[PDB]
Amino acid sequence: RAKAKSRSSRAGLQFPVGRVHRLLRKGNYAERVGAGAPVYLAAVLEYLTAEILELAGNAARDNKKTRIIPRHLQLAIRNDEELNKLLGRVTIAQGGVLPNIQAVLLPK
Template identity: 55%
Template sequence: KSNSFCTLLVRFYHSTMATPKKVSRKSTKSTSQSKKAGLVFPVGRVGSQLRKGRYAPRVSKGASVFLTACLEYLTSEVLEVAAKAVIQRNKGKRITPRALTLAVRHDADLGALLKDVTLSRGGVVPKVEKALDKKKKSGKKSKKSSATPKV
């Protein structure tokens, strides 16, 4: 056993050198793209739908995050308007398809965006044409009853 400087250096180097088998990785939980972006809607699923849809040859990660954020914002706006409409009409605490339809149609921006959309079980906005309204009776009395008899 020679304890030369080179031998000691090689032993020390090999004992401290980390090989892939010896290195213990700290197990960290993976964070989803939605969590990283601060969104509730699934960014990964929207991204995979973009890729499967073949809308473009290549789709970046930023595109799926942006589209997911837009979808989440629009959904929150529609639900907010519908919730306000339900509360104002004292119709309970449940948002129905009818409440969604009425809320969207009465809002100018959402109505323009969703003008060609038909919501299932939503019905239509009640509207009566002016031509179909009942005509008001005039307050004039007939000539016979109002005329004074001549003597």
Template identity: 55%
Template sequence: MSESQCDMESSEELEPSRRGRRPKTSRSCRAGLIFPVSRIERFLRRGDYAERIGSGASVYMAAVLQYMTYDIVDIAGNIAANDHKRRIAPRHLHETIHCDSELQWLLGGTILPQGRATSKKRPAASTRRGRGKKTAHSVRRSHNAAVAA
């Protein structure tokens, strides 16, 4: 939901003929959240988690889920930017969960599809592209490095 959908002043100007009636606003808008409060309440009631569920429980749950989602996506975005990527891949989410101690405690047992293990130090990329012919100089240099090790 964008802020314009939650803006009460603009909706009052559109309907001047209705006196005494307040325009309908969702509970998500009233709470200032993006996550759907009503849908979360429906899931809580159908989930048989408790006999009674307070009206504030779904608002609180939506706020927690929104905060956690923002935090995870923010850290994963930073990791993607460090990899010089513009999109967040499952690998970035996996690294996010396993680098942060609190997220590791909470989501440590979660399996992400295509979320490969965190990479150790990657070797520096060579400036040479493609698979050209090996020159005698590069063969000697790799042989000398192997002998020295």
């Protein structure tokens, strides 16, 4: 038959719409999924992934490292005002913290 086109490709996404919708079809998140839910969900998922990978890589470069470590994730998700909010109640393994030293605990 026709050369089969995927659902990540037709829409123009990298995250698997087939796999996303798939977790949804047998995920009981609902009872009869439509034909746009996985597309929107994957699009936004991967959008946030890109949003963060950006800040993580930029901080990494600030550290003169070419590989993103979990530190390049703690520093980032705490450096950006809205990523921190979204991931406020999330601990990133082996990420560390940001060097926020209280002003009153300094040399005087």
